[PDB]
Amino acid sequence: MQSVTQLGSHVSVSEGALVLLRCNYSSSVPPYLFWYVQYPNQGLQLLLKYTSAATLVKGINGFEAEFKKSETSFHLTKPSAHMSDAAEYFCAVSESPFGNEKLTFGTGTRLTIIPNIQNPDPAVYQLRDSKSSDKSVCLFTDFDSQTNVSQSKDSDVYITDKCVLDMRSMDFKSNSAVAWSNKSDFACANAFNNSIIPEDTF
Template structure:
């Protein structure tokens, strides 16, 4: 069965410093992987997705993630944090071999950005 683990429930960085949000996955098939962002009391917005093309995926707002099969990881990074990046981030996996279309969400990482 597929699963996703976000290793940090809360990450705090200073504005202008790099961001690293960690995600490890488990999947029986070639996975599709996503990162979503959720601002307080709002719906989720897709940041980026990996679907077996290039392993380094660039998303919106300067975020990117690298798919590393050997490490079963899909960490989200950004070179320089902005105050507006403060939100909760979800790593998501789905199996291409699955028929139910179940997107499995991690528990989320809350990113705080200090001025």
């Protein structure tokens, strides 16, 4: 139980790539180790636990972790990252085999997965405001994961970071970002002037 560290607060991997999250502990007494995951809108849930029973410990959702005494580590691996793996992961140590006594948690690693966009044609579109408030929004969509969106300088204008959505029945993922304003001179054709692609439709 005495202490725990999670080196790397943020990890980003490609859909398909090795996931590795670090956990390292000190303990005056024999440690019992624990990996917890916290999916988006959900609570803490146990992935796996090390009792003094075996070294390589298989857990839920295709995670594994090897307990190494000689390196004071219990690293969490999975060979192939899925989009559904995006979450925060928390390592923990206790003095009880079961986890009955106080768990001391580490600082957490947010895991993000970068989607493999299959066949990209980027585009900027204007979306009809559903009422009479002629503040349209503009939608940058279908860009490759390479592309990054950048904030505005002129802040009567609001842009949001890139986002990923999966339409599971069509086996289709696509990135999007949204720009909008109340300014009547705000053209969609010229929001998003940052790290764009030459071949975007309009």
